[PDB]
């Protein structure tokens, strides 16, 4: 067979430097273990400094912090500060009461 | 590390740098000279001097000192 | 710029210079210089 699963091969980006270890399975496993959604902050409005309570009439943004059934995600999952989690949950509950979410 | 500080050593500390406490070598020198004179005195008096160190690699230094 | 600003939405500098005879004592000063 001339095919390998993507999970068993690492694609080295262009312009990056590499070591021989980057072709091993240890690199594959190490990349899975340390795979965190750290790029969310730059794409996370609520981790930017905006007040989540100003989005109570924008269900599309709020729908990014609820599960498929509408259950607000725990702070352990959203990664927000206590204040933003508190404000975001209020926004979602207000949005639900208005008839938008 | 400053996180592991035993504050009873406060008077020996020169400052903190790069997350560790820097020991005041001016005091180390004075204490070392005093300790050295004690070893010299006991040796000159014929006493038994025991050198105890159980960290890896210390044996060579310990054996030659004895 | 302050009083001598071109913004449509100016600040209180302009209103202060007016009541302080500055926007007028400078308009005459500039015009006198032009003379």
């Amino acid at each position: 067979t001339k095919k390998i699963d993507q999970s068993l091969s690492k694609k080295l980006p262009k312009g990056t430097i590499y070591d021989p270890f980057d072709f091993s399975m240890g690199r594959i496993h190490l990349d899975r273990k340390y795979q965190a959604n750290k790029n969310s902050n730059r794409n996370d409005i609520m981790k930017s400094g905006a007040n989540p309570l100003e989005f109570y009439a924008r269900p599309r943004i709020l729908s990014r912090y609820v599960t498929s059934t509408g259950r607000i995600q725990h702070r352990d999952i959203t990664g927000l500060s206590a204040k933003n989690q508190r404000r975001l949950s209020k926004a979602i509950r207000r949005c639900q009461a208005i008839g938008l979410m | 590390s400053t996180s592991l500080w035993r504050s009873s050593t406060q008077s020996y500390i020169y400052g903190e740098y790069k997350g560790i406490h820097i020991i005041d070598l001016n005091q180390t020198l004075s204490y070392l000279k005093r300790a050295a004179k004690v070893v010299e005195g006991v040796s000159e008096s014929g006493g038994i001097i025991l050198f105890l160190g159980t960290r890896q690699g210390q044996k060579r230094g310990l054996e030659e000192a004895a | 710029m302050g009083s001598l600003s071109n913004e449509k939405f100016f600040d209180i500098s302009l209103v202060d210079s007016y009541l302080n005879k500055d926007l007028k004592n400078i308009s005459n000063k500039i015009d006198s210089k032009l003379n």
Binding site: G79 | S3, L4, R6 | -
Partner: protein, 92 residues
């Protein structure tokens, strides 16, 4: 910012049932493929000849192959050895 959770002092640091990777038996997988090969191309089909030959060699002497079927975890040995050093406990 990621919340660090610090444990209280503990009587021990131990994993109840340390996970171990049990590599799959080479003879069992050979048998699982041959059985599948017969399911599609048919029993005794000439397409599964190589599978039959390989299976016979794998199982010739031992039905599960000659393998080092022994693997144990050492996490509990190291955890008990290093706990006092790394727990960050205050001095006495």
């Amino acid at each position: 910012k990621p919340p660090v959770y610090r444990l209280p002092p503990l009587p021990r640091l131990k994993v109840k049932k340390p996970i171990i990777r049990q590599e799959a038996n080479k003879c069992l997988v050979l048998m699982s493929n041959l059985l599948q090969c017969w399911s599609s191309y048919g029993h005794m089909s000439p397409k599964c000849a190589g599978l039959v030959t390989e299976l016979k060699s794998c199982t010739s002497e031992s039905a599960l192959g000659k393998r080092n079927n022994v693997q144990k975890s050492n996490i509990n040995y190291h955890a008990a050895r290093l706990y006092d050093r790394i727990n960050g406990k205050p001095h006495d």
